[PDB]
Amino acid sequence: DRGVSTFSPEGRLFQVEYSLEAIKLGSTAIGIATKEGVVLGVEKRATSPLLESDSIEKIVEIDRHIGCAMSGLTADARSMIEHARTAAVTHNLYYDEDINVESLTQSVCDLALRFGELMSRPFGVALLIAGHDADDGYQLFHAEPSGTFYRYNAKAIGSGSEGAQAELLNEWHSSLTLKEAELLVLKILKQVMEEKLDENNAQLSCITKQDGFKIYDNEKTAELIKELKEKEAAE
Amino acid sequence: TGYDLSNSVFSPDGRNFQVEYAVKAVENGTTSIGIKCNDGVVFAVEKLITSKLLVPQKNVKIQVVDRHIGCVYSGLIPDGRHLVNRGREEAASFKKLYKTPIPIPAFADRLGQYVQAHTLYNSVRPFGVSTIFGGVDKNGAHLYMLEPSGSYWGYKGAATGKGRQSAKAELEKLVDHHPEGLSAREAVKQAAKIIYLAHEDNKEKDFELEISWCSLSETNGLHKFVKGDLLQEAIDFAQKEIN
Amino acid sequence: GSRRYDSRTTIFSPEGRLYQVEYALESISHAGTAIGIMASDGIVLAAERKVTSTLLEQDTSTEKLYKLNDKIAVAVAGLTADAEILINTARIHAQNYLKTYNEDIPVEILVRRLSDIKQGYTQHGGLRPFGVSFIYAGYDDRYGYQLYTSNPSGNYTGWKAISVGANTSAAQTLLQMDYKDDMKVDDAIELALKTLSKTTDSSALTYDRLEFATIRKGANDGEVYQKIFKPQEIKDILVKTGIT
Amino acid sequence: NNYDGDTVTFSPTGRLFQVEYALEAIKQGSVTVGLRSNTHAVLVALKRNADELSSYQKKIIKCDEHMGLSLAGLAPDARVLSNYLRQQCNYSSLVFNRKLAVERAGHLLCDKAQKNTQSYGGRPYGVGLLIIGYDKSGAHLLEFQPSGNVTELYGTAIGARSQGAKTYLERTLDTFIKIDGNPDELIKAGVEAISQSLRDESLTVDNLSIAIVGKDTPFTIYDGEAVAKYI
Amino acid sequence: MTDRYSFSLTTFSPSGKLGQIDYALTAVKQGVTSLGIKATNGVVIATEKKSSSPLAMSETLSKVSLLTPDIGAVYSGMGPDYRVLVDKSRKVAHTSYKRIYGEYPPTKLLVSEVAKIMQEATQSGGVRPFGVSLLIAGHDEFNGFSLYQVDPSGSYFPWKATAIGKGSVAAKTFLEKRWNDELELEDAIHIALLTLKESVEGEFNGDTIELAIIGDENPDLLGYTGIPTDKGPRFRKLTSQEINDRLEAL
Amino acid sequence: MDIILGIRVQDSVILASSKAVTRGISVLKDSDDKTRQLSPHTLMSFAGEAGDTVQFAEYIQANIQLYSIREDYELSPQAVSSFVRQELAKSIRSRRPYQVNVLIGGYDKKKNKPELYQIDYLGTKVELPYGAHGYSGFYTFSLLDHHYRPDMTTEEGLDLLKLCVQELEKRMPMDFKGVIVKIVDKDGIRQVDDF
Amino acid sequence: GYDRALSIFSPDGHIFQVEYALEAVKRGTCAVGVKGKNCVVLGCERRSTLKLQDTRITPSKVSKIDSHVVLSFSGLNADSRILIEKARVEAQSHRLTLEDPVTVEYLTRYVAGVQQRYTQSGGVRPFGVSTLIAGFDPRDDEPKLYQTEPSGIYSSWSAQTIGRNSKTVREFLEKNYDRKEPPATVEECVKLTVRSLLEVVQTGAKNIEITVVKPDSDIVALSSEEINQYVTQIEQEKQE
Amino acid sequence: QFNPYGDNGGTILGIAGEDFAVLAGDTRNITDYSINSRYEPKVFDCGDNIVMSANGFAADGDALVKRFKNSVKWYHFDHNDKKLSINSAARNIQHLLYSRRFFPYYVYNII
Amino acid sequence: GYDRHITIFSPEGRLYQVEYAFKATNQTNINSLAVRGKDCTVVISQKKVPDKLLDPTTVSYIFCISRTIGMVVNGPIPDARNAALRAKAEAAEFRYKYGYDMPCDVLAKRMANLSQIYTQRAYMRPLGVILTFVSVDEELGPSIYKTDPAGYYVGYKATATGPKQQEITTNLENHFKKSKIDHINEESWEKVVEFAITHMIDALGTEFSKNDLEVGVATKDKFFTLSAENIEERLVAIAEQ
Ligand SMILES: [Cl-]
């Protein structure tokens, strides 16, 4: 057939590029960074109404100061999360401190290109890693299966990504409040989702310095959805 | 067909096309030569100046093995370095066990067997270099040339690279006109000339001359680079002959 | 490199089938028919040797029926050499169990172990599967008399009566017709031979083209006896049942 | 064509296509410039962003107090190779109490990249590196290609549109080599060199990345408002 | 380097055929004819010494080989494959039996060990099957005399008499007419020579024929005296002269 | 640990095991249960070096519980005892052997018979009507040799056990803090809460 | 060792070997899971192409992983044994190290992890198996029902089906199962499970298996006659 | 029998102020009753405003300091030139020391 | 058609890679010959130095494997040396393990077994060489044993190898048909070498100078090669009668 670690004539790794196509098929995940915190939100996308939607876990805690949202082949993310959690806790063991968000992201991305003929293929999932540390403050990273990671003020991944990213282009500014960011994620998720957005098929979360990483209750998100509807009807 | 897609596969001819394709990489490289003299050997190589930004005399191509063997090659430069690294390991283990420095024929086979081993499996690629090497041992001077196939012989004069035909012709004249032999200092001058004459095949870009030598009288049987006045004297002699 | 020449023995087809397992089953379908029938007071194993010769030494020959231990035997259908590899593994497994627990291995446990080995060759290793189907006939004190079958997929199932190898479709129909639950060994012996006599590709069914075996509690008091039939004993049972 | 499936296969003309495809990845990468005098050596790198919300990918990596490099191509491959250099620089210090020679650092990178081009299963590195450093023989600049070829130069550039900067340095050769004991003027020449490779976009405060090493100057990287001086 | 062929080279085709085994059997068909006949008081194995050149000394090439003092072997197909199998067969007879039980293995079990080796070359990674069929004759105390055939698949069958290779089909027919259960060893040797003459084109004599027997114990070939229970090998290779003597009464 | 006793009567097996755990000159606990239920009708008591005891017992327990799930069937006390013996005989030639002596008391539901097995740390198995490990048997065997019948009731077995314990409490220098007693019969395993 | 990458991406971003493993599941016999208010019921199809079978000894479709958790499946039978064995080993290993039996969610997460590992490991193919894992957590009376698949994804379900014609029975469950008021009793839960299988099965004789799991390790398999009574009552109400 | 340990003597002293800290040590190196050096430094600047001294067996002391200095170097590489706090260095040193629990660094260390 | 790339069976029961290895044997275009005397074994081979730049002393296809065993190779030099090095290692190991000098025929068998493995194992290619081993064995006397890429080997009264082997073979066949003996009835090895050269000249139909030939001689307890001047003396004696 052909090698797994093969370069294309354009100078790209075939398998890495193909894994990026799998991520485009995944459910939407959005992240917005502010000076009051970083907000993470995801489309749950249940395949059937009998599926208990609260068991869909696409937003995940890595440490108290680091959260993580995923998009693509979500089964592949489990070993990445496991490594991230181990890395975070291990650094706390060796250095008696919290680990930098960038260092954590770098550790996750080091797994990415460990494939050949090590694991047999790249990961088919993208990660939005959001957190806070004392040095660089509130941060949001986009970790790809290429091993590359970019920092972002705001970022969308998944099926409605390019449409959402254009919307985030216009809406984001450096003075955004946390409440404003929450509504902004809900707004854009509602725009790109197939089914109608509610508290059961979409999930919010955030990371603040004080309270750390928190996944929002369905009752709490429901109010933010109702607050969104009213403010859009206001003009 | 398909016999040329995999290394270590015999074609219906009884040929290993992958090795023959490695030879093409060698033929694409710059010219390098070797000259056997009365009590030693001389090595010379053509270094193409791709740009003015290249620092003169810094990108050294000729490599020493142990303290008495010199190695030069044409083709894929990294492959040549890999081969010399192995040569240094082979020379070290020989001296470790047997005390005496490795003889040149002994050293030649060590490389030969290693290069030949890379024609036995499809999991490895053949070497993209022909290597001219040699020096002085207890039995005197020796010059060798080693191909991608693992084939090597002893030589009076040797040449490889893009200007090998021109070089070979010049070497053949020296063998005929000097049956009694050639001195070490003469061989350095002649080596410079031959590289300059062989440069007509790479005449687009200008080049830098690099020479080394092992001689029982001139260098005490140790490998040394030709530097300063002796190098300039060889360049002047070479420039005088082309005009 | 070497990838070029790899057949990839352990992959799914677009339809979700294992190529090599399916092709191995095709191989087994050309093998001599083997039949197993379970009765209330014992088990019968009958099997047809493939186009023999007059110069084959039959009394010292064994290609179909093998002994795993004193309580368990197998009928083979497929590559004999492949079967012997597995048979020796099963014999060892039975002895390991006996050494560990000081009790004879339950039939199902032995069957599961062999079937798990077969399964491994379909999921990893890059090797071809074993081209073998077994009929296991055995006894233990939990379930009593038992018949199982395993195939190259590593899947196994329990039976009252079953056939493997050639003409199983025809053979299974004939068994399904004449089999009853209150049946006895002597009746089951007759059924097995009659089924082979009708499904065989040969002109006539003779003693020299058959291997036969029974597992009976017909041993002096509460115990089990394995009987691998001799050529002369197969000749007699053929006359008794009225086939020759 | 038929001979580009893996790195272990020569083409009929003696070419290694997988290595050439890896070389192609460098040309797609953002431009970076290297140049030196007798006292100092400078790296200048144009950083690239994903979009306006994203950060600008870092191009320069420190290897030791006296050595470092800039990258162009697959960044993860630069992380692997720079990590190797860090270890080799460190082995030289711990074992021999000796700062690693820049020339020897190049030889090590060459030999590491080569093993990936001759063996089955692996792949060539997909990145080009410009290594600068100051050792016992003064200032140095190296260019690394993943084919294995390493070259010592006065100045050079790699990445997209790198030919413009390389021509400028070829003209300026006699001028910038003489810039001794003046770090700011040497950086100016590097910033002016990388400017010859720009189209549409220009050098902004979070776009530009500069690094320097010299006689009494440890390898230090300048980003953000620290390079506003040179814009 | 490393052997990266960890996968099977023999695989099932859609029809259920194992191609490489079939092809190996084809190679056996092209090979020179060899045969084996079992008598009441012995076994005989025979084949033609097909000399590649008249300058070659055909005595140095032994097609009929001793495996144990009471077991011999002959083949049809690829000679080099046979040679290595004989080396392995001799060794396995010691390692897996004699060093354990202090006696040589019975014919059927040694055959079983050889069969196992040939089966593994049919399933293991990065190897082709052996291109030979073996005929193994032997004797042991509890089984008496026996003759076995072993094929490239690893399958083995006991025979009263049989033939393999070039003219096996014709030779097996010839043996069916002549064989009975009351044959003495000399009668079996006579039939072996008759059967083998049909498949040989050129010279037919002691120098072009290789023939060995499993028969009575040979105390003269033991090499030592003093132990009553050790009575010598039953395997004996017939000399060039001994063959020619029986060709006059042919 | 110190004293573990076992007695097989007509229709049950009774196991008595000391309650004390001791570290040097201090009694850490006086209510320790030195037993694990391997299966519903099989109980194993144990005594030996600290750590090794519980590690081995729970390792055996896990293996038997695994077998039970896999086959949906309870192994006979004889099968369990033979498994345990093999593990100890394997252990004794290992780098660091388990230093544990055990008693296995079980009711075979097939044969409708109670069974008691004594196995030491070397892997020495013996089926007995009554048994003990360590210095226990030295004091108790003379009473058991005298009073034991195979047709004894469970209540008679307990009275003979009280007599054995009373003798230990008089002549043993070490205070083992009484015993926990458990009965294994057709209905399963239960603990005598007053002894 | 055999290191070949069998599960790999294709140009359109699909891992065909994982998708072909789902086709093996589609071929497998139907399996259904329904959780009531205080119980979970697992229903399984038995194809009647195989008669003369010995039902005493034939491997049952529902397997106990521990005393409080069960696992049914659809797809390759031989593959399912390997997952079940691993799950059973892990269940004892959890009790041995943490002194608590596994939660249903944990056991599911383990099994799903194993399945995933076989989609990006060299020299191995994915499991051609989807599982339904059901039970009750230790000292808990909330019913648990999870599903896994060859890719490695898992999720919790109020009711779910897998295997051949699962599309049909899922259609039935979606309109018949009410979340606000689930099957209050065991009878109602079993009846709904049998009804759902009767949409696909063919004959209601020996083709339907039912296994009821209740809290506190109370697991029992229904017999042929007990199930046949459900089949009788359902069709008699249908004649109207 | 070969004894891998030795005693190079020496004594060290650390005192913490309100906004400063000192680490003192004598400069004498010895074996038995002999003096090896009258001036052999024992307290070192390890970077990030941290000073360190490993007193006891000099060969093990030199190795530990050398490793910790190296640990500081890689802390910068791996965590964006972040300053290694004194409490973080202490915890890192615990792991250096316990990494040889069954063949200890025979030194008493102060930072 | 991957059955022609690696050593597996074709439908005809053939190994094409082995067959193509035989064809590589003649790539050098050199013919060799071996004969036996009473007390010696002689091997001769053509020597061709086409390039003037070559050092003719280093151009050789005859190898001294041990003190007693000599080996001439027909095939490319890299494979030839590969085989030579291995045979030297095997001969030395044999002496160390078993306490006596490795016989010629035993070494041949060992090298043949190694070659057989390359015909069965896929990852290893056959060596494109034919190895002719010669000695004066202490048990068997003058000996010639030849190995090929198929793993086949056999003893010889005399033998020939190369492009024009058939012409040499028939020439030798005809001589032994007359004399009716398995060797050259001659006392000295000098005359046995003269016989070998004479019959190669007659068979090939070409005259030889001292630099056109390469000669190896095996006597009791030593094998040695002849220098150019030793061969010249041999050529003079042939011409003078
Ligand atoms: Cl061998």
Coordinates of N, CA and C in Angstrom, one line a residue, chain H residues 1-109:
Chain H
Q1 N 37.5 -5.3 50.6 CA 36.2 -4.9 50.0 C 36.2 -3.4 49.7
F2 N 35.6 -3.1 48.5 CA 35.6 -1.7 48.1 C 34.4 -0.9 48.8
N3 N 34.8 0.2 49.4 CA 33.9 1.1 50.0 C 33.6 2.3 49.1
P4 N 32.4 2.4 48.5 CA 32.1 3.5 47.6 C 32.0 4.9 48.2
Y5 N 31.9 4.9 49.6 CA 31.7 6.2 50.3 C 33.0 6.7 50.9
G6 N 33.0 8.0 51.3 CA 34.1 8.6 52.0 C 33.6 9.8 52.8
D7 N 34.4 10.4 53.6 CA 34.1 11.6 54.4 C 35.1 12.7 54.1
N8 N 34.6 13.7 53.5 CA 35.5 14.9 53.2 C 35.3 16.0 54.2
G9 N 34.6 15.7 55.3 CA 34.5 16.7 56.4 C 33.7 17.9 56.0
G10 N 34.1 19.0 56.5 CA 33.5 20.3 56.3 C 32.2 20.5 57.1
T11 N 31.8 21.8 57.1 CA 30.6 22.1 57.9 C 29.9 23.3 57.2
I12 N 28.6 23.4 57.2 CA 27.9 24.4 56.5 C 26.8 25.0 57.4
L13 N 26.3 26.2 57.1 CA 25.4 26.9 57.9 C 24.5 27.9 57.1
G14 N 23.2 27.7 57.3 CA 22.2 28.6 56.6 C 21.4 29.3 57.6
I15 N 21.3 30.7 57.4 CA 20.4 31.5 58.2 C 19.5 32.4 57.4
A16 N 18.3 32.5 57.7 CA 17.3 33.2 57.0 C 16.9 34.5 57.7
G17 N 17.1 35.6 57.0 CA 16.7 37.0 57.5 C 15.2 37.3 57.1
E18 N 14.9 38.6 57.3 CA 13.5 39.1 57.0 C 13.4 39.3 55.5
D19 N 14.5 39.8 54.9 CA 14.5 40.0 53.4 C 15.8 39.6 52.8
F20 N 16.5 38.7 53.4 CA 17.8 38.2 52.9 C 18.0 36.8 53.5
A21 N 19.0 36.1 52.9 CA 19.4 34.8 53.4 C 20.9 34.5 53.1
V22 N 21.5 33.8 54.1 CA 22.9 33.5 53.9 C 23.2 32.0 53.9
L23 N 24.2 31.5 53.2 CA 24.6 30.2 53.2 C 26.1 30.1 53.3
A24 N 26.6 29.7 54.5 CA 28.0 29.7 54.8 C 28.6 28.3 54.8
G25 N 29.9 28.2 54.6 CA 30.6 26.9 54.7 C 32.1 27.1 54.7
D26 N 32.8 26.3 55.4 CA 34.2 26.3 55.4 C 34.8 25.8 54.1
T27 N 36.1 26.1 53.9 CA 36.7 25.8 52.6 C 37.7 24.6 52.6
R28 N 37.7 23.9 53.8 CA 38.6 22.8 54.0 C 38.1 21.5 53.5
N29 N 38.9 20.8 52.8 CA 38.6 19.4 52.3 C 39.6 18.4 52.8
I30 N 39.1 17.3 53.4 CA 40.0 16.4 54.1 C 39.7 14.9 53.8
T31 N 40.6 14.0 54.0 CA 40.4 12.6 54.2 C 41.2 12.1 55.4
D32 N 40.5 11.5 56.4 CA 41.2 11.0 57.6 C 41.8 12.2 58.3
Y33 N 43.2 12.2 58.4 CA 43.9 13.2 59.1 C 44.7 14.1 58.1
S34 N 44.5 14.0 56.8 CA 45.2 14.8 55.8 C 44.3 15.9 55.3
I35 N 44.9 17.0 54.9 CA 44.2 18.1 54.2 C 44.5 17.9 52.7
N36 N 43.4 18.0 52.0 CA 43.4 17.9 50.5 C 43.6 19.3 49.9
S37 N 42.7 20.2 50.4 CA 42.7 21.6 50.0 C 42.3 22.5 51.2
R38 N 43.0 23.7 51.2 CA 42.6 24.7 52.2 C 41.5 25.6 51.6
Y39 N 41.4 25.6 50.3 CA 40.4 26.4 49.6 C 39.7 25.6 48.5
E40 N 38.7 24.8 48.8 CA 37.9 24.1 47.9 C 36.4 24.5 48.1
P41 N 35.9 25.4 47.2 CA 34.5 25.9 47.4 C 33.5 24.8 47.5
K42 N 32.5 25.1 48.4 CA 31.5 24.1 48.8 C 30.1 24.6 48.7
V43 N 29.9 26.0 48.6 CA 28.6 26.6 48.4 C 28.6 27.2 47.0
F44 N 27.5 27.0 46.3 CA 27.4 27.4 44.9 C 26.2 28.2 44.5
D45 N 26.4 29.2 43.6 CA 25.2 29.9 43.0 C 24.7 29.0 41.9
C46 N 23.4 28.5 42.1 CA 22.8 27.6 41.2 C 21.9 28.2 40.2
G47 N 21.7 29.6 40.3 CA 20.8 30.3 39.4 C 19.5 30.6 40.0
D48 N 18.7 31.5 39.5 CA 17.4 31.9 40.0 C 17.4 32.3 41.4
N49 N 18.5 32.9 41.8 CA 18.7 33.5 43.2 C 18.6 32.4 44.3
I50 N 19.2 31.2 43.9 CA 19.3 30.0 44.8 C 20.7 29.7 45.0
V51 N 21.1 29.5 46.3 CA 22.4 29.0 46.6 C 22.3 27.6 47.3
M52 N 23.3 26.8 47.1 CA 23.2 25.4 47.5 C 24.5 24.8 48.0
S53 N 24.5 23.9 49.0 CA 25.7 23.2 49.4 C 25.3 21.8 49.9
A54 N 26.0 20.8 49.4 CA 25.8 19.4 49.7 C 27.1 18.9 50.5
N55 N 26.9 18.8 51.8 CA 28.1 18.5 52.7 C 28.1 17.1 53.1
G56 N 29.3 16.5 53.1 CA 29.6 15.1 53.5 C 30.6 14.4 52.6
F57 N 30.1 13.6 51.6 CA 30.9 13.0 50.7 C 31.0 13.8 49.4
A58 N 32.2 14.5 49.2 CA 32.3 15.5 48.1 C 31.9 15.0 46.7
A59 N 32.2 13.8 46.4 CA 31.9 13.2 45.1 C 30.4 13.1 44.8
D60 N 29.7 12.8 45.9 CA 28.2 12.7 45.8 C 27.6 14.2 45.9
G61 N 28.3 15.0 46.7 CA 27.9 16.4 46.8 C 28.0 17.2 45.5
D62 N 29.2 17.0 44.8 CA 29.4 17.6 43.5 C 28.4 17.1 42.5
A63 N 28.1 15.8 42.5 CA 27.1 15.2 41.6 C 25.7 15.8 41.7
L64 N 25.3 16.0 43.0 CA 23.9 16.5 43.3 C 23.8 17.9 42.8
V65 N 24.7 18.8 43.2 CA 24.8 20.2 42.8 C 24.7 20.3 41.3
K66 N 25.6 19.5 40.6 CA 25.7 19.4 39.2 C 24.3 19.1 38.5
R67 N 23.6 18.1 39.2 CA 22.3 17.7 38.7 C 21.2 18.7 38.9
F68 N 21.3 19.4 40.0 CA 20.3 20.4 40.3 C 20.4 21.6 39.4
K69 N 21.7 22.1 39.2 CA 22.0 23.1 38.3 C 21.4 22.8 36.9
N70 N 21.6 21.5 36.6 CA 21.0 21.0 35.3 C 19.5 21.0 35.3
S71 N 18.9 20.7 36.5 CA 17.5 20.7 36.6 C 16.9 22.1 36.4
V72 N 17.6 23.1 36.9 CA 17.3 24.5 36.7 C 17.3 24.9 35.3
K73 N 18.3 24.4 34.6 CA 18.5 24.7 33.1 C 17.3 24.2 32.3
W74 N 16.9 23.0 32.6 CA 15.8 22.4 31.9 C 14.4 22.9 32.3
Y75 N 14.4 23.4 33.5 CA 13.1 24.0 34.0 C 12.8 25.3 33.1
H76 N 13.9 26.0 32.8 CA 13.7 27.2 31.9 C 13.3 26.8 30.5
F77 N 14.0 25.8 29.9 CA 13.7 25.3 28.6 C 12.2 24.8 28.5
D78 N 11.8 24.0 29.5 CA 10.5 23.4 29.4 C 9.3 24.3 29.9
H79 N 9.6 25.4 30.6 CA 8.5 26.2 31.1 C 8.7 27.7 30.8
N80 N 9.2 28.0 29.7 CA 9.3 29.4 29.2 C 10.1 30.4 30.1
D81 N 11.3 30.0 30.4 CA 12.2 30.8 31.2 C 11.6 31.2 32.6
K82 N 10.7 30.4 33.1 CA 10.0 30.7 34.4 C 11.1 30.6 35.5
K83 N 11.0 31.5 36.5 CA 11.9 31.5 37.6 C 11.5 30.3 38.5
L84 N 12.5 29.5 38.9 CA 12.3 28.4 39.8 C 12.2 28.9 41.2
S85 N 11.1 28.9 41.9 CA 10.9 29.3 43.2 C 11.6 28.4 44.2
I86 N 12.0 28.9 45.4 CA 12.8 28.2 46.3 C 12.0 26.9 46.8
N87 N 10.7 27.0 47.0 CA 9.9 25.9 47.4 C 9.8 24.8 46.4
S88 N 9.8 25.2 45.1 CA 9.8 24.3 44.0 C 11.1 23.6 43.8
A89 N 12.2 24.3 44.0 CA 13.6 23.7 44.0 C 13.7 22.7 45.1
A90 N 13.2 23.0 46.2 CA 13.3 22.0 47.4 C 12.6 20.7 47.1
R91 N 11.4 20.8 46.5 CA 10.7 19.6 46.2 C 11.4 18.8 45.1
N92 N 12.0 19.5 44.1 CA 12.7 18.9 43.0 C 13.9 18.1 43.6
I93 N 14.6 18.7 44.6 CA 15.8 18.1 45.2 C 15.4 16.9 46.0
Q94 N 14.2 16.8 46.6 CA 13.8 15.6 47.3 C 13.8 14.4 46.3
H95 N 13.3 14.7 45.1 CA 13.2 13.6 44.1 C 14.5 13.2 43.5
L96 N 15.5 14.2 43.5 CA 16.8 13.8 43.1 C 17.4 12.9 44.1
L97 N 17.3 13.2 45.4 CA 17.8 12.4 46.5 C 17.2 11.0 46.6
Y98 N 15.8 11.0 46.6 CA 15.1 9.7 46.7 C 15.2 8.8 45.5
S99 N 15.6 9.4 44.4 CA 15.9 8.6 43.2 C 17.0 7.6 43.4
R100 N 17.8 7.8 44.5 CA 18.8 6.9 44.9 C 18.6 6.4 46.3
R101 N 17.4 6.1 46.6 CA 17.0 5.6 48.0 C 17.9 4.4 48.4
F102 N 18.1 3.5 47.5 CA 18.9 2.3 47.8 C 20.3 2.3 47.4
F103 N 20.9 3.5 47.2 CA 22.3 3.8 47.1 C 22.5 5.3 47.2
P104 N 22.2 5.8 48.4 CA 22.1 7.2 48.7 C 23.2 8.2 48.3
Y105 N 22.9 9.4 48.0 CA 23.9 10.5 48.0 C 24.2 10.7 49.5
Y106 N 25.4 10.4 49.9 CA 25.8 10.6 51.3 C 26.2 12.0 51.6
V107 N 25.2 12.9 51.6 CA 25.4 14.3 51.8 C 24.2 14.9 52.6
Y108 N 24.5 15.9 53.4 CA 23.5 16.7 54.0 C 23.5 18.0 53.3
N109 N 22.3 18.3 52.7 CA 22.1 19.4 51.8 C 21.4 20.6 52.4

